[PDB]
């Protein structure tokens, strides 16, 4: 109903900020005519696409009635709306790690500090508005909470790509001697493109710049490996929980060796075969079994006891087949 | 057992070719000392990662016995081994479309034809060895066939990234005048980095090269949009089939309105509620229901008729609950 809301507008104000800050990063990158922020104004186009996947899936997870197309309802839509955002992220912390290994073998000089720093700090205070509207991880059942942990990592992934930038734009502005047009800046780090044009005149004398320090150029790719080893540690408890539900694994709360034992202790029941337990979404566990009873008349209270021994483990969707003989 | 095999070695010879052709694209890109094939020898590192996902999933889909961790077996492992390869591909036909829109706003000249062409044609005859070992789409139930349609598109995705290269390396070698060191090549397409160094002497006379044609530089990014609109048409029938199984949709073969009608026509059965049908993997469909019968003694032949009316739609995993009264 607002920002302080109900999982619908709170994903929707944030698409109304990423879409406007991507405008503010294109307008600045045409007025100053620098074409190196067009490679960072497409950095927040992988954060508009990853807020539509969590917004389409939230529109379908409200149809829990028995459709003719799905007999359970679309309540497992928001379990794999969080499997997609944790595979679209792991295939994005792989394109960072390959782009930040090309900068090792040939470096790249940032040209305009105090304009990059005028957008890095001005973008760090948008992605520390995502990380504060996502309470239960904003320090002031698990069906939709599992979805908005997929778009918590697409905001933690971009409030760490605006601390690499701000710690980079300060090192260049406070320590880099640079190379203006002429007067002995040889760049003995970087391969100089104007190589066959400095041979005309050894100009005046020893006017040594030598581009200042050399270790500075390898600081934007050293930090894009410490950023990658943090997201591939934080996204692994999401890629395990919401992808063992879809494989229909027995939930962690439930042990099989104390259900098949307790079904055989009920009087009248001889044995139990073909027992299945899976988890639909969150705390809705569904269980079925076969039972070979003996008396075809007393199957009115013996079903009440078997319904109870599933009731004392928290599972309610029961179905049993009395194979009479 | 060999290449002509059993889904195990046939995925495994191809990882023993992509790993060796990535060696042949690094050795050439250090002897000629060109650092522009290191950006294409990491093009086949998204085709070693996408042949391990289909090889880990194939090792787990052979455990169809009832584990204590999964009561159904790991037979749905190779249904989402093909959901990952069709989301790792769609998040890779998105990084192409953003890298081939930076080349529109500033072009980029290829430097060495007849070495790129010596690797493009030499890599087109590796990815038309993937597209011929993948019969049922190599023109000379659906459980594992759904997996090796995920790594058919990671080979069709790289036998179309070696026809862009070979149609590009022929246009430069047959039509590009180039710009050698000196003698009036102004590049009136490309922003010339040696701009303040040509002002020394208007050298001899009108010796016009002007870098030859201008439309040639926009031919490697025109074709990486016709390549993207083909993979996002071919991968959509895979991303729909193997992601409506995991949401437990009623299969396309089965209509609900001719099962709940036919259960009520069986004598003795009064009505039917709580009917569920989903698909485990391939042609294994599982169905459960509740039935309010009337006679607690005649539940020995009425179950045989209800087992038949599910048998005449191809589904066999049945479980029914007679709610006697």
Curated annotation (Swiss-Prot), chains A, B:
The chain crosses the membrane at residues 11-31, 36-56, 79-99, 114-134, 152-172, 212-232. The keyword Cell membrane applies. The keyword Ion transport applies. It is a multi-pass membrane protein. Changing residue 202 to A: Loss of N-glycosylation. No effect on localization to the plasma membrane. Increased stability at the plasma membrane. No effect on resistance to zinc-induced cytotoxicity. Glycans are attached at residue 202. Keywords: Antiport, Cell membrane, Cytoplasm, Cytoplasmic vesicle, Endoplasmic reticulum, Glycoprotein, Golgi apparatus, Ion transport, Membrane, Metal-binding, Nucleus, Phosphoprotein, Repeat, Transmembrane, Transmembrane helix, Transport, Zinc, Zinc transport. Induction: Up-regulated by zinc (at protein level). Up-regulated in macrophages by LPS (at protein level). N-glycosylated at Asn-202. N-glycosylation promotes endocytosis and degradation through the proteasomal or lysosomal pathways. Residues 32-35, 100-113, 173-211 are extracellular. One of its GO terms (cellular component) is dendrite. GO terms for biological process: cadmium ion transmembrane transport; calcium ion import; defense response to bacterium; detoxification of cadmium ion; detoxification of zinc ion; in utero embryonic development; intracellular calcium ion homeostasis; intracellular zinc ion homeostasis. GO terms for molecular function: calcium channel inhibitor activity; metal ion binding; zinc ion transmembrane transporter activity; zinc:proton antiporter activity. Zn(2+) binds at residues 43, 47, 154, 158. It catalyses: Zn(2+)(in) + 2 H(+)(out) = Zn(2+)(out) + 2 H(+)(in). It is found in: Cell membrane; Basolateral cell membrane; Cytoplasmic vesicle membrane; Cytoplasm. Zinc ion:proton antiporter that could function at the plasma membrane mediating zinc efflux from cells against its electrochemical gradient protecting them from intracellular zinc accumulation and toxicity. Alternatively, could prevent the transport to the plasma membrane of CACNB2, the L-type calcium channels regulatory subunit, through a yet to be defined mechanism. By modulating the expression of these channels at the plasma membrane, could prevent calcium and zinc influx into cells. By the same mechanism, could also prevent L-type calcium channels-mediated heavy metal influx into cells. This is Proton-coupled zinc antiporter SLC30A1. The lineage of its organism: Eukaryota, Metazoa, Chordata, Craniata, Vertebrata. The chain holds residues 1 to 422 of 507 of the full protein.
């Amino acid at each position: 109903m607002g920002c302080w809301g109900r999982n619908r507008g709170r994903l929707l104000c944030m698409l109304a900020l990423t879409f406007m800050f991507m405008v503010l990063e294109v307008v600045v990158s045409r007025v100053t005519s620098s074409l190196a922020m067009l490679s960072d104004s497409f950095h927040m186009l992988s954060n508009v696409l990853a807020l539509v996947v969590a917004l389409v899936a939230e529109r379908f997870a409200r149809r829990t009635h028995a459709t003719q197309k799905n007999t359970f309802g679309w309540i497992r839509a928001e379990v794999m709306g969080a499997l997609v955002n944790a595979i679209f992220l792991t295939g994005l912390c792989f394109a960072i790690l390959l782009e930040a290994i090309e900068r090792f073998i040939e470096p790249h000089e940032m040209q305009q500090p105090l304009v990059v720093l005028g957008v890095g700090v001005a973008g760090l205070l948008v992605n520390v508005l995502g990380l504060c509207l996502f309470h239960h991880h904003s320090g002031f059942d698990r069906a939709g909470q599992l979805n908005m942990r997929g778009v918590f990592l697409h905001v933690l992934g971009n409030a760490l790509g605006s601390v690499i930038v701000v710690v980079n734009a300060l090192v260049f502005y406070f320590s880099w001697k640079g190379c203006s047009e002429g007067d002995f800046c040889v760049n003995p780090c970087f391969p100089d493109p104007c190589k066959a044009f400095v041979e005309i005149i050894n100009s005046t004398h020893a006017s040594v710049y030598e581009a200042g320090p050399c270790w500075v150029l390898y600081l934007d790719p050293t930090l894009c490996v410490v950023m990658v080893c943090i997201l591939l540690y934080t996204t692994y408890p999401l890629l395990k929980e919401s992808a063992l539900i879809l494989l229909q694994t027995v939930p962690k709360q439930i042990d099989i060796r104390n259900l098949i034992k307790e079904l055989r202790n009920v009087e009248g029941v001889e044995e139990v075969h073909e027992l299945h337990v899976w988890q639909l979404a969150g705390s809705r566990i569904i269980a079925t079994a076969h039972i070979k009873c003996e008396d075809p008349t007393s199957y009115m209270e013996v079903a009440k006891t078997i319904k109870d021994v599933f009731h004392n483990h928290g599972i309610h969707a029961t179905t049993i087949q009395p194979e009479f003989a």
